[PDB]
């Protein structure tokens, strides 16, 4: 009723003479209903899952980014193209590309304790390989090029850099019941539920 009202009111305001067909209205409602976002629990009953929003950079001990994939993260949309402002740019101008790349920075900057980054490494069908968001590439590329693991102190730029990348990237298993998640160490699962399966402890 609100959206529907506001829509019509806005027309009446501009004093629209002609008659209007339902589609015109139904479509506007649809759109309006698709841009309305519900985020009323944004900070009570904890662990907030949401999208990266512009102009909402808050400090958190933990910050994790998921599906930061090429083609998925810096989010896109080309200006209308008959947008004069977009071809002759100026310092104030905004664009999703910039907003979005700047949000990935604000993330890095606001995490106070741990930054968690995740992406999908390959579709589970054609088993072809995926790729991370260039923004994530840049982040591990600059880490690698400025750190070295205690062991490797005398080996090589390129050599030490790879190891640091390989050390922070953690390939995960296709199924949650693969044994590797139940060995000891880096993220053994807290999910006993799959233990039996993992240990082939079943009865045919």
């Amino acid at each position: 009723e609100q959206q529907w009202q506001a829509i019509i009111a806005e027309g009446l305001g501009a004093q629209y003479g002609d008659a209007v067909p339902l589609s015109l209205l139904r479509d506007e409602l649809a759109q309006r209903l698709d841009q309305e976002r519900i985020s009323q629990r944004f900070l009570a009953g904890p662990v907030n899952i949401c999208t990266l929003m512009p102009m909402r950079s808050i400090p958190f001990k933990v910050v994790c980014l998921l599906g930061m994939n090429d083609g998925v993260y810096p989010r896109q949309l080309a200006p209308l193209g008959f947008d004069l402002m977009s071809q002759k740019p100026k310092r104030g101008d905004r664009s999703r590309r910039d907003d979005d790349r700047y949000l990935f920075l604000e993330a890095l900057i606001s995490a106070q304790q741990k930054l968690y980054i995740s992406y999908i490494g390959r579709s589970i069908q054609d088993n072809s390989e995926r790729f991370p968001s260039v923004l994530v590439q840049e982040l591990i590329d600059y880490i690698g090029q400025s750190h070295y693991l205690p062991g490797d102190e005398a080996l090589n730029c390129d050599e030490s850099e790879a190891r640091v990348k390989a050390h922070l990237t953690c390939l995960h298993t296709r199924m949650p019941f693969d044994p590797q998640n139940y060995q000891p160490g880096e993220r053994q699962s807290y999910a006993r539920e799959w233990l039996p399966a993992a240990s082939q402890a079943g009865k045919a």
Binding site: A44, P179, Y182, L195
Partner: protein, 99 residues
């Protein structure tokens, strides 16, 4: 296709095939006759040592921090109600009839 390259195009005897194959044929290309076979095995074994266990956490639930609002009262149904319209006249509810 394979037939056309082997028999250079012209059709052949069932034996004219055999002779074309032999024709192009040394170490790189070779032929044998369909030697059928049987022996249900793929005689392969296994071995396995499932030495596993799962991390159990020793922290505990304890306390819960929340943002409430005189909803500590008003039982649900308002699930997603207070969410979609923050200021809906939540205190009302129902139908109306022959009045």
């Amino acid at each position: 296709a394979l037939g056309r390259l082997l028999q250079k195009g012209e059709p052949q005897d069932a034996a004219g095939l055999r002779t074309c194959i032999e024709a192009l044929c040394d170490d790189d290309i070779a032929w044998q006759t369909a030697q059928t076979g049987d022996n249900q095995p793929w005689q392969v074994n296994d071995v396995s040592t499932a030495e596993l266990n799962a991390k159990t956490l020793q922290r505990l639930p304890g306390d819960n921090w929340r943002v409430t609002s005189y909803s500590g009262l008003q039982q649900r149904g308002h699930g997603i109600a207070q969410d979609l319209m923050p200021r809906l006249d939540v205190d009302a509810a129902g139908v109306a009839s022959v009045v």
